[PDB]
């Protein structure tokens, strides 16, 4: 129901206690999904489910500074399934983004970009039907 890629403004950036919720459905033959929490051209937090990286499924997380990708953080727990509805929740904590999918904790990503209040856009891209993208303070 939403156009992909989708740009969700985060007015005044993010802050601890901010909860971002993404609802959608993975497409049948999916290859990749991405959520990009952006500070201008920088990507503070790139969350990238990969359905076929050397014939394994993995989540790659990273940061892009001055157009250069940094050290990737991988996690092999992979809760997405092609063709299935998902909920990603990203809770901003003091020292990390905390990600839960379908109400189960998945991973944490320490803040490399420190200017939380300047991470003012979330890009949602890839092989999904996007249902909703929203935020709230908890
Ligand atoms: O390309 C790979 N690695 C280099 C880069 O790694 C970065 C993280 O360190 C980024 O993931 C970068 O991708 C950027 C990107 C992703 C993207 C996406 F995920 C979408 F769903 C849609 C559009 C996208 O456009 C992009 O530029 C990506 O190009 C890559 C390598 C090896 C693989 F097996 C891959 C499998 C799936 C996807 C990417 C790869
Ligand atoms: Cl910074
Ligand atoms: Cl909202």
Residue numbers in the entry: 113 to 250
Article sentences:
Efforts towards the discovery of selective and drug-like inhibitors of the galectin family of proteins have escalated during the last decade as a consequence of an increasing awareness of the important roles of galectins in e.g., cell adhesion, tumor growth and metastasis, inflammation, and immune regulation. Galectins may dimerize (e.g., galectin-1, 2, and 7), oligomerize (galectin-3), or have two ligand-binding sites within one polypeptide sequence (galectins-4, 6, 8, 9, and 12). These structural features enable crosslinking of endogenous glycoconjugates (e.g., glycoproteins) via oligosaccharides that carry the key ligand monosaccharide galactose.
In order to understand the structural basis for the affinities and selectivities of compounds 14 and 19, the structures of their complexes with galectin-3 were determined with X-ray crystallography. Compounds 14 and 19 were soluble at 20 mg/mL, which allowed for co-crystallizations to be performed to generate crystals that diffracted down to 1.5 and 1.4 Å resolution, respectively, with 14 and 19. Furthermore, the naphthyl moieties of 14 and 19 indeed bound the pocket perpendicularly above the β-face of the galactoside site, which provides an explanation for the high galectin-3 selectivity of 14 and 19 as this pocket is unique to galectin-3. The coumaryl moiety of 14 is similarly positioned between the R144 side chain and the S3 β-strand, which is different from that observed for earlier coumaryl-derivatized galactosides in which R144 is aligned along the protein surface and below the coumaryl moiety. This is most probably caused by the interaction of the coumarin fluorine atoms of 14 forming multipolar C–F···H–N, C–F···C=O, and C-F···H–Cα interactions. The closest interactions are with the Cα of G238 (3.0 Å) and with ND2 of N160 (3.2 Å). In addition, longer fluorine-amide carbonyl interactions with residues R144, I145, and S237 are present (3.6–3.9 Å). Interestingly, the amide NH of both 14 and 19 formed a hydrogen bond to a water molecule short-cutting a salt-bridge between R162 and E184. Furthermore, the hydrogen bond network with R162, E184, the water molecule, and 14 or 19 extends via the ligand amide oxygen to accept a hydrogen bond from the galactose HO2. While the coumarin 14 bound four-fold weaker to galectin-3 than 19, it displayed a better selectivity over the other galectins evaluated, as 19 also inhibited galectin-4C (C-terminal domain) with low µM affinity.
